[PDB]
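User: For a benchmark we're assembling, each entry needs the component sequences followed by a predicted structure for the full assembly. Here are entry 17's components. Please fill in the structure.
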Amino acid sequence: RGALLLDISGVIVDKPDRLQENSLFDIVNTIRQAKDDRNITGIVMDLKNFAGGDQPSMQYIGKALKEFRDSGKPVYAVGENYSQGQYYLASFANKIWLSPQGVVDLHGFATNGLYYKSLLDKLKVSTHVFRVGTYKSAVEPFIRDDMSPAAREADSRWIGELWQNYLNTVAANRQIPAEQVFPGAQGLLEGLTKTGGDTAKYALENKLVDALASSAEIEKALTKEFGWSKTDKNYRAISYYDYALKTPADTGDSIGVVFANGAIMDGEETQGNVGGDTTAAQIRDARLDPKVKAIVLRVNSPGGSVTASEVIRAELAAARAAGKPVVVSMGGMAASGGYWISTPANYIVANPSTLTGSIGIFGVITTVENSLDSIGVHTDGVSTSPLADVSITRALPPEAQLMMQLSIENGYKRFITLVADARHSTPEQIDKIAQGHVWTGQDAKANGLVDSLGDFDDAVAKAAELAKVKQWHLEYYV
Amino acid sequence: RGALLLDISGVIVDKPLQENSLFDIVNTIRQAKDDRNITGIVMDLKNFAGGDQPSMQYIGKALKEFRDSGKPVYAVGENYSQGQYYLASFANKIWLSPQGVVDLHGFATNGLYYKSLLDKLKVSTHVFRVGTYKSAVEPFIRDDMSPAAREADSRWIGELWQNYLNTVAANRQIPAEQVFPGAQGLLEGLTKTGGDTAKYALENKLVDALASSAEIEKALTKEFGWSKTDKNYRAISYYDYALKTPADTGDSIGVVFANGAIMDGEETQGNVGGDTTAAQIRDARLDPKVKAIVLRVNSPGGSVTASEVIRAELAAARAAGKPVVVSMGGMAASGGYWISTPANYIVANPSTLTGSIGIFGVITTVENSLDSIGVHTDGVSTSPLADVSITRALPPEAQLMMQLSIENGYKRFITLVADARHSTPEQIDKIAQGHVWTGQDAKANGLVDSLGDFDDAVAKAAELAKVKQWHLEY
Amino acid sequence: RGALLLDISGVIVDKPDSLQENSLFDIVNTIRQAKDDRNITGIVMDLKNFAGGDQPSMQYIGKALKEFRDSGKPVYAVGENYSQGQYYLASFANKIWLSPQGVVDLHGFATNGLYYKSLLDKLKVSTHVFRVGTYKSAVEPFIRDDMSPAAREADSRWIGELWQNYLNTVAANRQIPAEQVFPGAQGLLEGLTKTGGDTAKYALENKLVDALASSAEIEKALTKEFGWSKTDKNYRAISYYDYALKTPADTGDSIGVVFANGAIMDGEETQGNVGGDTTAAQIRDARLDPKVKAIVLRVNSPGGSVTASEVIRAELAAARAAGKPVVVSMGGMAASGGYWISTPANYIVANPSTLTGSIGIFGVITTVENSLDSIGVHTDGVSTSPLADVSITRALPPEAQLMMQLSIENGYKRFITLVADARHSTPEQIDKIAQGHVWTGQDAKANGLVDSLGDFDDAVAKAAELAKVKQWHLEY
Amino acid sequence: RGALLLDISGVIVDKPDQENSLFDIVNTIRQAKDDRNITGIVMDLKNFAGGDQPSMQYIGKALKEFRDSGKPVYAVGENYSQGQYYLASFANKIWLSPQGVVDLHGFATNGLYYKSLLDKLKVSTHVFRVGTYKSAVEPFIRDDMSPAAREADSRWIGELWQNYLNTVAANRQIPAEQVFPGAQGLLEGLTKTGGDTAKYALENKLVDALASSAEIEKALTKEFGWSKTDKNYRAISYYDYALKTPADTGDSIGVVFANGAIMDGEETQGNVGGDTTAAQIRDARLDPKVKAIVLRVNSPGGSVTASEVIRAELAAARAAGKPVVVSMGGMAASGGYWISTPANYIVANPSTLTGSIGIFGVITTVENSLDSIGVHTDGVSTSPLADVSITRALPPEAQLMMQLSIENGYKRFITLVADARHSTPEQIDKIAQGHVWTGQDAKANGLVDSLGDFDDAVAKAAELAKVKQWHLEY
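Assistant: Structure for entry 17:
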């Protein structure tokens, strides 16, 4: 009998490439095993080396911890300090211990990017942006020295919300109002001034933390609830990394689980990206395995290559047409191309804090003929068509401009049409909520882009509801 | 049974996936024609990065032949680049994605020109040249292409694109200008289709059907049958399909490759080594089983001194009475042509780029560049001919000698070619002076004997001796 | 039966980071073994590939050398040349040989630091300093183009003392006045002009060295003393590197030795650095091992992370609270963070040449928003608080400034509070000897920061005395 | 069983750390001279990048011995570089291509001079030097050569080029001015000939016949015969012809190399280690079966403390009764001469570059360069002598000690040479002052005892010692 010690070191991810990358589902499933397991009597969270996860993922680990607590097992969180990310997770604890010289470091959210128009003018770089989408702002750095007013309003909307969800969640976890979790900068400074700059008393007096206590006082309290081990020389516990997650029994009705974790590129899966052909081959696999009864596509992608996306879409559409229901589970990001790949699904579930939509399209051509000219380098040559002088060192010909603008207008019509046919809508109605506008899962649910607010559990349960009643999971991490 | 799957990945080259052998491709297609077990060919070219035009036309021929035997050839893809499509266009039936494009845009050349940079940097440029159209020296002395260079390059690029269009025309049975109507024409045809590139391709018959990956799968499994084992239509990939190792008759024709720039040393990097190549020819010239030689050339040229070593072993072979046939495949220019000179017979593809009979040297020194940052040189010499280095002014004595050496090198080139192509030096001038020529223009002015491909050069070789043969490679 | 050959190559360090790095303790313990081993008849020091050690440390080897000597075995020093550091050790020898054309290179001590206020202004960099410590001088590079007067005064005091410590020790070893070991630059110029720029004659007439000889003569003289090995074709000797130090008998009753060597980092160890978690775990092992009766913390550290220092301290404090005495042994440096961790001990011993103190706290933030703006690069984005809006490419928001300044004021108060509670003093008393001021072990002892002046031997002896009996060392 | 083919590839060196040992070459020619399996030598030096004149002359000497036993030596090549042709000229017969060139052009010296740049960067330079002719220091202090340097350098380069001419003139039995007439003459001679470089070479007797590569292979078989196995003329490459390992007589002469710049530690790179060489000399001194020591030197010099370590060991081997003879090969200057002073006897090639008895040191600091970009250094020091970092000005006390140190170093140097050369510092001063001296100048002024080569060094060591000897190396 011991505690499960959650000494997560590193980041939380959907799928890999004291480890630096930790699987969200492996963490949750281990916690749930710990729940039913007679030999574990509690969890301790030691999050010093934990670097963070997206809000939808951390909320999921949280859900597993509430389920754990609701069984009547204690969950403790200990540390000298908490970053904003560690505290979010720690907030789901029964009880939070802080060092008497420690800080709870709550400071808000911020987005930040470089803008280079002025530098491009000075280098005499020639820039061409082809885009459809007033709010498709990844383009702005080449053509502004600042974010556009449209970009500003879309980005304020989402970030302001993701942060309210941070506060509402943590507030509820701690049972104090949101303004007390974080009162803003004026109030934090006022609070910190009473306590004479003591961050830990501010934390204790405002209920962010339950007790201040040294590392040895913590140990005494932990051995008292969990007992002492003569072999280990500590309180009785076993680390996440040594606790064995029992490999689940296989039924025969399986639900296939395919990851789209990362930027979507054209070929095989390289780096930490999605490869169109690798993912399409994993989908094909489940589509032809008679054992596999439904597919869940777990998406965490900003997007990427339009040809890559189409290839993946095609396959999911074939799976569903083969009579295997497709359910998308969105976890953090499923935007642009990552929304593109989700469209053929029977059902789309997103986390309220998920970032999605961004239904729009862009392309950027920079050329350097003038930059080279100014230092006396030129290019010259012969061609059979102006359509053939497209190169970084040559001016973009107007023929190639015309084709590029037509290509991009056509691709945008493609996108809103797919979504229009997928979402039981009209290309004209989709235009009203597209134009490159990024939406949180909450907004997307409100405007039709997503079907229900939830998590991977909800996606799986739904895929199972489109057929039968004892399932197990086939993953394609291979 | 099953299809042969031509899922070529990478480039085509004479002599090494990523590098694929032209000859293994052609011979596998030819073996698959006679193989009861192959019932057709599917081309999947998505990872195929191109080849030169002669080479792809060669692979075409083998596809036409496979086709002429009654077996089907199919092209499938989401999209086609201009390289992929040339090849695919040999297929009976071309399948495009309903959102795909066939991306035809023409041919273009492009190079850096630096006269002004070198002047700003205060570099001294020394040019030694014979050839108005030997234009590869222009970047050092111009900011743009010379009017002469522009005519020469427009000529051959013009021809090569026409060759592209005509072949693809003939392959699709539609007029050349419908294959590619020019920029305006392409714009007008895309407007009319709402910018649907695939509808454009289908209405102009670039392609035979629009269809999805799993629509193509089905249509392919109907034709080739379903494999319970692989869970796909019946097919073996070219990379897994064993090409049979041909029998040693006992009378052979040696094939030697001069693939790349020609270097003095031995076979380095992706280059031709004068001495490795000379030795491969020596091997063939003295093996009594070898009845003739085919020199398969694809080279921009390079080292004149290494050119001679190769040329001399070739002449030796011919002098001992072994016929030497050159098979040009893509490029055989300058020194690629220098080593080709002693052959009994010279064959180029019409799209081959050859000639460029001319000579040049460039010296850049940096004395003034250093001087302006306060770095100088000094020393003693026993002759100004000794004072020759990147950091010092080029001595006028050194200039006179280098000029003389280049004038002489030029005379050597045209004399070699005059002797070898049954002309006079003065006549070879009128068509040398650095000018690049396509196989067609070369044939027309005597530099080349006939238009064809490797098949014809082999055939000519066996015919300059006698009648049953196998190939020996080195 | 040979000489012991101290042909040391590289530097001396408390703990080699698994020659180049030679262990202080292995050297000292091998000389002591060689004193009682009838197979070793003397020591020969060949230091041409010896790149230095800190002064407390070479003093400590010196002490082993004096002990070897006092037992009646000779110590000889040999070189074509002596660098300033090589000569310190050499000077403990009975007799020093120098090449007839060689030099004893004594020149003094010097500090040297870069200062780039003017650069940062030309480069349009924004600088933000959060400091408490008038002599907490490691900030001056960002805000000045030269030392502040306060910084000069403090650095002059310690550098002066350490160079005097060097002269006084070397003088004593050679039995000549300290001004004759080194007369100043003017005196050296004088002694050398009188000699025609001949450094060996200077050295020999001023008694820095005992005799002048080529390698092939010294050889002769040394085989006279040690006898000739026919097998090795050389005088009878064995190198330090081949001569086995014996692993001491095991008692049961141990004193544990934990190293705090280098910059103090938050992680675990990996580098040439101290890792908070790694050092705490070592201290824990020793704390819970009933075998271990006392702990010695061997410190040589410029400092580093406050939070990692706290981790180390808390384990030390717990060790002491559980009844195991903790004795600090300060080596070359034990300053700032390296003093923080020393604070919980029953007893602090430093070498008089140790640099310690430096009780203060600092913070520097540079941002590059104006540097980017001048080349047409800009940042922009959205935030829910200015507190979130902190990174190298943005202006430091006024709200963040106020928070960092509170933080620094509070960190200084932590520090002096800790020190005042540990050295039976008041916070207001420690301020008068804090303010970031660096002090020698001697100035440290005189102001209460340190309990006694001595070396490693004195720290061990004290640890044993705070418990009892006969001991031996568990290293970690 | 055929020609020894010297298809030397790379460079000649004293000791290989591409690199061919000078002695392995000489000792293989001498073995082949007396081996009845070798009927001749063929020199194929297309891949030979050169060696110093003294070394090539040494190989030439063994070629002459080889030729005098009546076995022929042939030189074959498409071209001859200046280095290559020096060697080829020791052949009975020299064959050139009819397109070939003999590239004779003289000698040059050239160096960078940095003063202007150093002042532009505001660098502070402190030069400490004794020796009007110690010119290695001139790039730190000026834009160009001082008249002193250009006199010293014209002198030795002139002499080395004339030795080149004289040797090659003797080898070809034509007068020197015919070998290379100067720029004017070469250009005229190449004009009475249409720019034909081979015809220039044949008419002026640089070369014996112009001949195709196959015309050479025909005359080379016939003389050496044909091998049906190798399918060439009978022949074995230098690299495959085993040099037999000489016996252990009973009395040895130690050969110790000092090849390259002299550094302070152990041997690294292509440099001399003061302590490494010393241990070698020391093993020599103590191994009772070594009766003499030869120090083979090819060094521009380097570190004085490392030179002294070496000198002292050698002086000790001599005092211990073992004679020391120096063989200079190419360079033995500065420290390379310091280390040579203990010897009973010094032999230099007339083309050896030695002397340079002189001393210098440079300190550069960057306080003003850093000042101008707004970086400064500050700190506390207990003496001005402790402020000696590159970012600090050099303090006046340190300048004075440095000058006094260099003054004393030069005194030590002319003093060592005075003792060793039976002279006085006053007499040595007249021939010191940093002045570089060829072998011949050094023999005339008394810095060297005789002109000769490794063989003479060895013979002289055996004479001072006695009897029948083999060589022991390290």
